[PDB]
């Protein structure tokens, strides 16, 4: 039976979407379906920031950040536990988790 109305992807009123490569296991996945995780993480973790402050020659030097957009296939997205299965009612909810 039809599990997901959208067929677990975003392509509507469109023929074919170009494929991309899963950041983990290098699987070929369509761009629309792929789980996209755009992570903006500080170049140093808060635990190690203290040691950089004193050592730095510059005063009030704002620290750089890494911007990297990870693409996950459904096999790897579920195994890595970034996304897990939900109830048949809570599936239709497409609101991102609040933090």
């Amino acid at each position: 039976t039809k599990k997901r109305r959208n067929n677990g992807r975003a392509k509507k009123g469109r023929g074919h979407v170009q494929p991309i490569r899963c950041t983990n296991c290098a699987r070929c996945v369509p761009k629309d379906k792929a789980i996209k995780k755009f992570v903006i993480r500080n170049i140093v973790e808060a635990a190690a920031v203290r040691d950089i402050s004193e050592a730095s020659v510059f005063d009030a030097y704002v620290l750089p950040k890494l911007y990297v957009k990870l693409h996950y296939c459904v096999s790897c997205a579920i195994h890595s536990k970034v996304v897990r299965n939900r109830s048949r009612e809570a599936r239709k909810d497409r609101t991102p988790p609040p933090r």
């Binding site: 755009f38 750089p64 950040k65 890494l66 911007y67």
Partner: protein, 213 residues
């Protein structure tokens, strides 16, 4: 068994007259063995230095690539080779609900340096805008691209490196594009993303020394 670092001479490297902070730092090279001169080792040497390390009170995300041209008795003579933008800035600029506009142009300076200038721009979220997206239509983009191309052309065709660098220190090119392209579609951040030296003239010491004083 010999330590090579015993046979290394440290040469001080100075930036040309465009920048305030003259002293950049020290580079070591192997001593002249007779066959090959120490100057030849320092001749084709590049230096990617932040703008805030060249000018005292200027921003620190517009990195300047400086090539050595001559060596003058312990002191190294550098000239402009290119202008790069730092990664974190370039990554922090690109947002998911706005059109990015990129325009590259080849221009010949009057004194005879061939530059390739890449200028990038982003559409502005208005202050009272409810709509989620702020995209520009293909013609509006083409008009903006033509506008920033012809501005870059005009403003770097007429003058020479001496003046072009001084124009790029505050990024006056960008500010003028932001002001000019406001009417077609409001721009958010318009920087000169990249400047690359393509071709050089036949080297002479006189102009290189004039660039330093």
């Amino acid at each position: 068994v010999v330590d090579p670092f015993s046979k290394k001479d440290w040469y001080d490297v100075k930036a040309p007259a465009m920048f305030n902070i003259r002293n950049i730092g020290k580079t070591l090279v192997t001593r002249t063995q007779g066959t090959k001169i120490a100057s030849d080792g320092l001749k084709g040497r590049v230096f990617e230095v932040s703008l805030a390390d060249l000018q005292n009170d200027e921003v620190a995300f517009r990195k300047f690539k400086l090539i050595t041209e001559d060596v003058q008795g312990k002191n190294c003579l550098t000239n402009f080779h290119g202008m790069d933008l730092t990664r974190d800035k370039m990554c922090s600029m690109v947002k998911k609900w706005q059109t990015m506009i990129e325009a590259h142009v080849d221009v010949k300076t009057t004194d005879g340096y061939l530059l390739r200038l890449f200028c990038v721009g982003f559409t502005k979220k208005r202050n009272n805008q409810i709509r989620k997206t702020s995209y520009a239509q293909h013609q509006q983009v083409r008009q903006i691209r033509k506008k920033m191309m012809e501005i870059m052309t005009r403003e770097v065709q007429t003058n020479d490196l001496k003046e072009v660098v001084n124009k790029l220190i505050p990024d006056s090119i960008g500010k003028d594009i932001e002001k000019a392209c406001q009417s077609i579609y409001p721009l958010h951040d318009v920087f000169v993303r990249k400047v690359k030296m393509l071709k050089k003239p036949k080297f002479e010491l006189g102009k290189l020394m004039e660039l330093h004083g």
